[PDB]
Every structure is written in structure tokens, then in C-alpha cells.
Ligand binder design. Structure first.
Ligand code: MGT
Lengths: 148, 14, 726
């Protein structure tokens, strides 16, 4: 048979994050997350181009679709994106080996997504950008500057 | 970073 | 207690407060207590660790030794279970797992569980596979390999009990290894040069190692043997006889491992300060590298765990572990045909290793990188691509910090040569992960000759292009754009030229804009390029627009194939055409070819699985049977399209390679130019990347393409490919 210790695949397990605008139950969301080929990619620079995202995330497999993360008002890059693969296995490999490495000198984080819909590309922060950029105290040149 | 924050304004058969 | 049993058996051998001897003693006791009503579980769990954890071999053979001593009948049922599992694994073509089971049975002789004459009888039957006729070399190779690779563990114990019988095995083995074919070796070597290290054929090398072990009275200095500590208990333990073993015979369902070539970049002189590195022809070096490979195989998915296990590798004597780790990693990354795991894993594992040993590992890594660069001149092109991709991606994780001036010798050499071409492509790859200006900064001003160009659009029926420009800007429909293309003079290749140039120029801002353009005016593209020569011209124009931005070419060609603007055959011809003649040695060409080939191969696979998902739906239920007749037709049309894509590619290789070889003997020039090295090895690459698919085309390839009429330079590549499963 197999050993549970070797089957261990901690980089592919689900994060604590869930989507609030998701029309559905939590157990209905988890069921989509476990079959998804689609990744949220956090902590990008606003200067990070699709050229760069495509080059890096291509290393785990052939990319179906990159959907850049946009400011709701400005439609400028506000520091995240989505990456869709054709197979689960290729998305799993991104989560295993690209998650927690550098893209444009920033440690980027990946997460399973339940699936892109229209509206999800836009930052849900009050001032248009990501929610993460409104609270924060720190300075961060790639993320705009100070908070808001 | 000496470059601009890019503005993104606006089916597989084989 | 079933969940408890598994974790107890798994945890022994790992980090512990107590010693290893204490834990085995304790576990052997706990397992004997559970024998009354969990004998079935424990037999199966110990068979599983024997098969899946060969890196911890001697820990578990010892554990079985202690259980055999307390309970003879358990040891009997275990050796039975292992023989069942061995035959199970061989029947299923899991020859790589089978070796681990054979080595486990071997080392169980050292624990006084299996009688030494039984293993000599089994190994008699293994080596007798070299006598069988009308069977492939790779079958014989494996049966020898399973024998030879068991000897570091059991070679002493067998030679002392039955040296007469063993000398016959070594005579039969030695005679076989003399008469083996070596046609494959030039295809699998990372470096053709044999200085500073010959890249040896894997059975030749193991032989040399087993000879030196025999010459040193079967004394080896690395393998931890916990059983030696329990010598009192294991002497008195009663042995078992393996049944006589008939090796499952060859069928045309049988699939054996491909031959290998031992990667080699270090000897002891690369680390004079640290412990002395065991030599190429020592069984110490074999057992170290084997276990390190097995650790990666067990933990490849957990990069941080994988690093920890490598760094904490135990041995009887001290070894320069950082050098062995870096070597074993590059041995996998550069393995031919393919690495055992996805390429990018190795980049990350090396980073996690730098994190875990920050005082020493980065220095060893940088030294190795230097040595790889210095030996580029004979490095296979397939491996050079992996080196470029690894190194560029590594640098991108450490702020592109590198002592570039260490490689100044490339600036005075011919730009086509391996070293400056390595540096150009690395910097091109760095730019893609970064941006143009950042790469200009991080290199010395002497290196900005080798830097890539700025990735910009080249925009060019003068009045017709001005009309289309207005129509796109004004949010026009497909009908209107098609209507505007009526007014174009024919020398129709100029309709495509003015359409493609204008649409790509106006969508040149990003990949998403260019992808939105192809989707919006999809119907105009399909009409303009339904002709085969119409497809070829869309690619020719699209190149002339984006020849400064290789990445954009690649992602466009991809979208054009996916939406059927062009087909794989068009892209294949386009790559070997004269428009890409200047850029033929550059990497992006072959990225596009291989990406194209992959889309084709996946298309076949998807149609093939829709077929078996329909046939399995028929079997469960016992109109649907007529859907199966349709899918078998789609498979055959898809497989036909696939075959033709390879036949196109091979034809074009044979043509341009022949065209070079004829002009070289006519003009009296050197054959082995930089351009030829690329081309012959890119042909070789096609075979390596897709050997299992290309095996389906043997009859067509022997009769019509790779025939005796060809220059033996070109035919060698095909005979090499033959050798992988022959
Ligand atoms: C942090 N995010 C953000 N995000 C998605 O990115 C878009 C907007 O980002 P956001 O403004 O951070 O949204 P929100 O999730 O409400 O913020 P947060 O939960 O961090 O307070 C939405 O589609 C949101 O669901 C995410 N999607 C997944 N799958 N995982 C994640 O961790 C995150």
C-alpha cells in the first residue's frame, strides 16, 4: 500500500482564507477549492508585469489564463493576480515550488481559489485597492507607499 | 522601480 | 492501534532522545506483543517500508532480524510476503521498486533471517537472464544491476559462505558486460569530454566499484549496520530458505528501465579542507548517491522536509555532505532523458538548503556553478537549457547578485560558442523575470554587449493600414474590418501583412491586450489564414513585428494554435524556415517547438481518455457503443496529426543536417561547428523528450526517414534512440 507520512503534501492543503462574496456554503466552497486549477497570487508589486508572472508560473506547467488584479476605480495593477492552469497537477506544483519564492524581489504567496468570476479581479478595499493596503502602517515602495 | 503601473482598461478548440 | 502501529514503524530511525539500538529493541518488543491479533497488519507495513523507504534499509532489516529471533514463524511469513511482493512488482513493471526489495532480501542475510545459500541460488537465477535469447538488453541489464547493486550490503557474507558458486556468477556477469552494446552512451552523457571526469555507463561504473570492493576483502566504510550491535541475539536466531526463484519471463507487455550514465563533477580535490570524498569507483560513492536520490524521491513534495532529511543524512564515517548533496541534485536536474521530478523543484530545494546551511552551502553551490560554467564546451544542449533556467531563476531569488567578471573570458570568444551563448541566454532569461533596465544595472559595462535588447514592437498598402488603425480605435465590428481589407493590391499576402501589423501594434501594451485582440477579431484571422500558406504568412508577419520580444512570440503562437488560427504543422515548418535562420540556435525557438509538440500530445491524450471513460461507462452498464466508434475515429485522426508533426520535424532536421554535411565535405571545412552542435543535439532532444510516443513510429522511421542511406552522423542519433528500450 502506502505510508501516510510519505503521502504528506502540506504545501497543497487549503489555507484559512475564504471568499465572502462567494454565493454558497463553506463545504460547497471547499469542494471547489479541492478540484480547482486556479490560484490567487498575493503580495505582488504594483510594477510587476504579466510578462514576469507568465515566465515564473510557466515553470510549474502550461498556463491557461492570467487575470491581473486591478484597482476598482483606476484599473491599475493593485498588487495581486489569478493564475489558471489546465491541470490540477500543474497548479499543485506551483503551490509546492513557486509559493514563498521571489517575484520582482518580493516573497509572493499563492492560495487555492474557488474559481474566477467577473468582479473578483477588482480590489475590495474602500479606496479601490486591496483591503490589505488600507490598514497597514509600514512604507512599501512597490505597494504604493503608505496605507490609506 | 523606474517604470509605470500598467492600466488594464478593456474558447479552446484544439 | 493500526494508526499507532504505522507511525511507530515509520518514526524509528529518525531523530530521538535515545539511541537507534534502544528504539529497535523497544519497537521489536512492542511489535511482538501485537503479533497475536495484528500479524497481518505488521507483515504488510514492514513490506511497505521495505519497498518505499530504501534509504532506511538497514534499520528495518535489523528490526526484522530481532522479530525473527523472538518469533521464527513471523520471519517465515515475512520472507514469503516479500517474495509475493517482488513477483507483484515485476509483473507490474515496477523494476525500480523491485531492486529495493532485492536489496532488502540481500541484507536480511546479514541479520540471520535468510540463509546465504538461498540468496546465491536466487542470484544464480538472476544472472542466468543474461543467457536468455530473443530478449532486449535492458531486461538483462536490470537483472545484473539488481545483483551487483545488492553486493555492497551482502557481498561479504555471500563470498565467505559460497565463494565457489559466486566466482561462476562473476564470470558469467563479466562475460555479459564485455559483450553489451554501448550505443546509448553518447545520448545520455551530460558532457562528451572525459576530462576532468568520464561520464561512465552505469553498469560499467558499478562493475568497477564492485571489483574494488572485492579487492578490498568486501570491507566498506559507509553503510550503517545496526544489526552488528545485536550480534549476541542474531547469531542464535534460526534462518529461512528463500524458495527457488524463476524470473518472470519476457513478454511484449514488459517495460524495463532505460540505461543510465553516472553524473560526475566532484572528486576530493574540490574540497581539500573538509573530509575526503570517496572516489568515483568506490561503493561508498554509489551508496551515498543512491540514498540521497531516494531521500529526494521520498520527500520531493515537501521542499523544507526534503532539505532537512538531506542535511541530516547519517553515515558510519564522515563525508563532505554538502558536496554530495549539490552533486546529487545536479545529477537529477541534468539527467537524460529527463529528471525524476519537475525541473523547478530543484531550484527551490537548493534555496531551502542554503537557508538550512547558510554558512557553508552557498559557497559550495557557487563553486559548483563555476565548475559547470567552465565545462560548458562539451555540455549537452538539453542540459545547458536546464542550467540556464535554473541559474536565472536562482539569481532572481537573490537580487541578481553574481560575480560576472569571473566569466570575462567569454567576451573574447566567438559569440556562437557555449560560454558567451550561455551568458546571453541567462541574461535574456533574467530580463523576463525582471525588466530590461534592471539587467543593464546588475552587469559590468563590459557585459552589456551580451545583454538582451529592449522588448519593443516593430511597426511598419500604406493608406490601407491608416484606415484599419481608425477602425480598431473606433470599436468597429468584424464585418467592417473585413470590408476595409477589400482595397489591397495583390503582387493575398499583403492583406495579412497590413492586418497583423496594425492589430498587434495597437495591442502591444501587454499580453492581456494582445490576447483580447486575437479573441475580438478571431473570425478575421480564421478567414485570412485558412490556407496553409496563409498560416505560414501570419507567423512570418507576427515574427517581424515582435522579433525583439521572444516571450510575446511564444505566448502568441500558443494562443494562435489553441484557437486554431494556425496548426502545429504550420508552426513546425515556420521554425525550420529561413526567417528564423539567424535565431535558430536561440532558446525561444525550441521553447515554441516543444510547447507546440506538448499541445499536440495533450490533445491526443484528452481524446484518448474520453474514449476509455466511455468504454468504462459501457462495462458498468453491462447509442453509447456508437459513440465509442466515433471516438476511436477521432483518436486515429488525432494520432495521425500527431505522427505527421513528428515526421515533418524529423524531415526538416534530416534536410538541414544533410545540407550542412554535404557542403562541409565539398568545401573541405570542419564538420563540428557551433551551429551543428546545436542542431544535432536539438534533434537528439526531440527523441529524449518524447521517446515513448516516437517508439510508436519505429517501422515508418526505419523504412522512410532514418535509413542506411543517411550520413552516419544523423543515423547515430536514431540508433541511439533505438538503444533506450532495445
Ligand atoms: C487575500 N486574498 C484576496 N483574494 C481575492 O482578491 C480579490 C480582492 O482582494 P482583497 O481586497 O484582498 O479582498 P479580501 O479577500 O476581502 O481581503 P482580506 O480577506 O485580506 O481582508 C478578491 O477576489 C479576493 O477574494 C484572495 N483569494 C484567495 N483565494 N486567497 C486569498 O488569500 C485572497
Amino acid at each position: 500500500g502506502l505510508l501516510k507520512a510519505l503521502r504528506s503534501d502540506s504545501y497543497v492543503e487549503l489555507s484559512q482564507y475564504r471568499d465572502q462574496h462567494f454565493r454558497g456554503d463553506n463545504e460547497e466552497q471547499e469542494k471547489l477549492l479541492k478540484k480547482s486549477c486556479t490560484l490567487y497570487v498575493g503580495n505582488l508589486s504594483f510594477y510587476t508585469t504579466e510578462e514576469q508572472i507568465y515566465e515564473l508560473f510557466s515553470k510549474s506547467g502550461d498556463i491557461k489564463k492570467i487575470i491581473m488584479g486591478l484597482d476598482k476605480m483606476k484599473k491599475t495593477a493593485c498588487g495581486f493576480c489569478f493564475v489558471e492552469y489546465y491541470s490540477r497537477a500543474d497548479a499543485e506544483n506551483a503551490m509546492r515550488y513557486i509559493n514563498g519564492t521571489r517575484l520582482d524581489d518580493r516573497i509572493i504567496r499563492t492560495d487555492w481559489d474557488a474559481g474566477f468570476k467577473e468582479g473578483r479581479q477588482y480590489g475590495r478595499g474602500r479606496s479601490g485597492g486591496q483591503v490589505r493596503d488600507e490598514y497597514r502602517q509600514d512604507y512599501d515602495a512597490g505597494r504604493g507607499g503608505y496605507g490609506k | 522601480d523606474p517604470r509605470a503601473i500598467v492600466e488594464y482598461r478593456d474558447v479552446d478548440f484544439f | 492501534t493500526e494508526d499507532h502501529l504505522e507511525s511507530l514503524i515509520c518514526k524509528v530511525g529518525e531523530k530521538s532522545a535515545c539511541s537507534l539500538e534502544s528504539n529497535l529493541e523497544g519497537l521489536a518488543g512492542v511489535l511482538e506483543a501485537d503479533l497475536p491479533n495484528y500479524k497481518s497488519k505488521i507483515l504488510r507495513l514492514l513490506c511497505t517500508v521495505a519497498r518505499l523507504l530504501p534509504e532506511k534499509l538497514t534499520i528495518y532489516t535489523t528490526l526484522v532480524g530481532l522479530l525473527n529471533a523472538r518469533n521464527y514463524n513471523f520471519g517465515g511469513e515475512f520472507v514469503e510476503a516479500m517474495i509475493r511482493q517482488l513477483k507483484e512488482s515485476l509483473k507490474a513493471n515496477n523494476y525500480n521498486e523491485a531492486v529495493y526489495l532485492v536489496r532488502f532480501l540481500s541484507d536480511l542475510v546479514n541479520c540471520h533471517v535468510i540463509a546465504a545459500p538461498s540468496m546465491v541460488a536466487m542470484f544464480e537465477n538472476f544472472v542466468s537472464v543474461t543467457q536468455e535469447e530473443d530478449v532486449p538488453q535492458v531486461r538483462r541489464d536490470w537483472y545484473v544491476y539488481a545483483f551487483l547493486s545488492s553486493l555492497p550490503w551482502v557481498g561479504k557474507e555471500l563470498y565467505e559462505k559460497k565463494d565457489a558458486e559466486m566466482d561462476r556468477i562473476f564470470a558469467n556477469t563479466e562475460s555479459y558486460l564485455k559483450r553489451r552494446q554501448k550505443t546509448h552512451v553518447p545520448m545520455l552523457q551530460v558532457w562528451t569530454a572525459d576530462k576532468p571526469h568520464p561520464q561512465e555507463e552505469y553498469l560499467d561504473c558499478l562493475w568497477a566499484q564492485i571489483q574494488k570492493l572485492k579487492k578490498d576483502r568486501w570491507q566498506e566504510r559507509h553503510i550503517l549496520r545496526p544489526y552488528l550491535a545485536f550480534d549476541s541475539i542474531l547469531c542464535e536466531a534460526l534462518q529461512h530458505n528463500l524458495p527457488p526463484f524463476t524470473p518472470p519471463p519476457h513478454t511484449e507487455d514488459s517495460v524495463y528501465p532505460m540505461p543510465r550514465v553516472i553524473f560526475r563533477m566532484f572528486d576530493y580535490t574540490d574540497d581539500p579542507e573538509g573530509p575526503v570524498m570517496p572516489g568515483s569507483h568506490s561503493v561508498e560513492r554509489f551508496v551515498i548517491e543512491e540514498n540521497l536520490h531516494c531521500i529526494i524521491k521520498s520527500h520531493w513534495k515537501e521542499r523544507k522536509t526534503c532539505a532537512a532529511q538531506l542535511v541530516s543524512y547519517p553515515g558510519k564515517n564522515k563525508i563532505p555532505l554538502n558536496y554530495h548533496i549539490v552533486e546529487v541534485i545536479f545529477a537529477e536536474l541534468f539527467q537524460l532523458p529527463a529528471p525524476p521530478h519537475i525541473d523547478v523543484m530543484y531550484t527551490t530545494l537548493l534555496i531551502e538548503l542554503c537557508k538550512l546551511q547558510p554558512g557553508s552551502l552557498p559557497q559550495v553551490l557557487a563553486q559548483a556553478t563555476e565548475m559547470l560554467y567552465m565545462r560548458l564546451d562539451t555540455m549537452n544542449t538539453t542540459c545547458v537549457d536546464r542550467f540556464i533556467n535554473w541559474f536565472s531563476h536562482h539569481l532572481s531569488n537573490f537580487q541578481f547578485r553574481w560575480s560576472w567578471e569571473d566569466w570575462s573570458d567569454c567576451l573574447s570568444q566567438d559569440p556562437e560558442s557555449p560560454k558567451p551563448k550561455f551568458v546571453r541566454e541567462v541574461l535574456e532569461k533574467c530580463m523576463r523575470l525582471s525588466y530590461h533596465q534592471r539587467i543593464l544595472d546588475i552587469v559590468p559595462p563590459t557585459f552589456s554587449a551580451l545583454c538582451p535588447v529592449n522588448p519593443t514592437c516593430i511597426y511598419k498598402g500604406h493608406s490601407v493600414a491608416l484606415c484599419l488603425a481608425v477602425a480598431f480605435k473606433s470599436k468597429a465590428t468584424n464585418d467592417e474590418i473585413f470590408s476595409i481589407l477589400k482595397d489591397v493590391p495583390n503582387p493575398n499576402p499583403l492583406k495579412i501583412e497590413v492586418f497583423v501589423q496594425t492589430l498587434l501594434h495597437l495591442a502591444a501594451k501587454s499580453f492581456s491586450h494582445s490576447f483580447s485582440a486575437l479573441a475580438k477579431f478571431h473570425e478575421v484571422f480564421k478567414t485570412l489564414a485558412e490556407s496553409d500558406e496563409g498560416k505560414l504568412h501570419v507567423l512570418r508577419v507576427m515574427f517581424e513585428v515582435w522579433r525583439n520580444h521572444p516571450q510575446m512570440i511564444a505566448v502568441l503562437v500558443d494562443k494562435m494554435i489553441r484557437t486554431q488560427i494556425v496548426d502545429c504543422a504550420a508552426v513546425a515548418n515556420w521554425i525550420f524556415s529561413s526567417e528564423l535562420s539567424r535565431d535558430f540556435t536561440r532558446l525561444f525557438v525550441w521553447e515554441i517547438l516543444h510547447s507546440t509538440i506538448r499541445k499536440m500530445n495533450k490533445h491526443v491524450l484528452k481524446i484518448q481518455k474520453e474514449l476509455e471513460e466511455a468504454k468504462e461507462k459501457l462495462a458498468r452498464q453491462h447509442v453509447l457503443e456508437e459513440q465509442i466508434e466515433r471516438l476511436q475515429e477521432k483518436v486515429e485522426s488525432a494520432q495521425s496529426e500527431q505522427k505527421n508533426l513528428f515526421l515533418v520535424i524529423f524531415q526538416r532536421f534530416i534536410m538541414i543536417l544533410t545540407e550542412h554535411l554535404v557542403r562541409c565535405e565539398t568545401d573541405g571545412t570542419s564538420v563540428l561547428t557551433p551551429w551543428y552542435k546545436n542542431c544535432i543535439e536539438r534533434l537528439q532532444q526531440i527523441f529524449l523528450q518524447h521517446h515513448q510516443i516516437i517508439q510508436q513510429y519505429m517501422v515508418t522511421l526505419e523504412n522512410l526517414l532514418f535509413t542506411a542511406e543517411l550520413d552516419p552522423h544523423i543515423l547515430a542519433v536514431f540508433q541511439q534512440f533505438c538503444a533506450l528500450q532495445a
